[PDB]
Amino acid sequence: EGRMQIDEQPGNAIGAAVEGFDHATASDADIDALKSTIYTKKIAVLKGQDLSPQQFLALGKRLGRPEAYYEPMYQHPEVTEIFVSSNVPENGKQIGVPKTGKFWHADYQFMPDPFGITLIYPQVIPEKNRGTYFIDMGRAYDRLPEDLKKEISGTYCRHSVRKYFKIRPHDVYRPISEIIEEVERKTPAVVQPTTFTHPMTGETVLYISEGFTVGIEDQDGKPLDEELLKRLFDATGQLDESFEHDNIHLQSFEQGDLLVWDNRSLIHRARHTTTPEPTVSYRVTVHDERKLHDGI
Ligand SMILES: O=C(O)CCC(=O)C(=O)O
Ligand SMILES: [Cl-]
Ligand SMILES: [Fe+2]
């Protein structure tokens, strides 16, 4: 230590900038302070990062235990733990998967044991149409009308990858019903409390997303009409295709930036493909000292 400096946005404004961070030399106190910033400011942007794929993984390992993506076509060829979103061919070859995350979601929300921190290391940044949209679903919960808070009290939600599972090269010539069934076997829908208590901050988090949350059910386990989910999406800003909604944050980045964010509190999505500019990003996803919530 002696050089990492964290500049948190004032008050309730989301985000922080971190200058002079070196994952190879940061002290234990440095890491703890960076973690506190991630949990409270939700998005920390590390500046001046010039890392190999291996050094990026080592940075992630300072924050938690990396987990590799369960579908391997997403994995970096040299680092299994790096998830690659890319539509720029490397020597004419497809690396990772193109055009990922074009829907509101929290990462691994369709899995039974989601990780708490996401790291994104942009490699190729669109000049004009850059950035990722975010919603703080704890702040979004607090801003719901009281009666809507009451209506979801005690409910559970079902989360599934079934809408956005991407066809793989080895799926060609298979009947689609067989892939549909395989997805339900490998990644069955996961039931979670509709809201949970953030282990690091104590905030109530509304843990739903338009992309992965496929149903809501009552305290007795009986399915509820999906209009309730639609009203929740609407109220939290997830149905606003203009992205002007008050809850929505557009996070931009520049070369050398590295985004680290709270994957309990936030949902995110890619921008509309308004321009043909390409996107390449490397992702590391790490488990921290607590489960997503105490009920996991
Ligand atoms: O499209 C997917 O499979 C999800 C990708 C993702 O998590 C992201 O692009 O932020
Ligand atoms: Cl994910
Ligand atoms: Fe994502």
Question: What is the fold's blueprint, element by element?
Answer:
Elements: E1 5-8, E2 16-19, H1 28-41, E3 43-46, H2 53-63, E4 65-66, E5 83-86, E6 117-124, E7 132-136, H3 137-143, H4 146-152, E8 156-159, H5 176-186, E9 190-193, E10 195-197, E11 204-206, E12 213-217, E13 223-224, H6 227-236, E14 248-251, E15 258-262, E16 266-270, E17 280-287
Parallel strand pairs: 2-3
Antiparallel strand pairs: 1-2, 3-15, 4-17, 5-17, 6-15, 6-17, 7-14, 7-16, 8-9, 8-12, 10-11, 12-13
2-oxoglutaric acid (AKG) is lined by residues 85, 100-101, 107, 164, 268, 270.
Structure, described:
The chain is globular. Strand 10 (195-197) and strand 11 (204-206) form a beta hairpin. It has one domain. Helix content is 20%, strand content 25%. The chain has 296 residues and is an alpha+beta fold. It binds 2-oxoglutaric acid, chloride ion and fe (ii) ion. The site of 2-oxoglutaric acid has 7 residues, from strand 16. It comes from Streptomyces coeruleorubidus. One of its GO terms (molecular function) is metal ion binding. Its EC number is 1.14.11.78. Keywords: Dioxygenase, Iron, Metal-binding, Oxidoreductase.
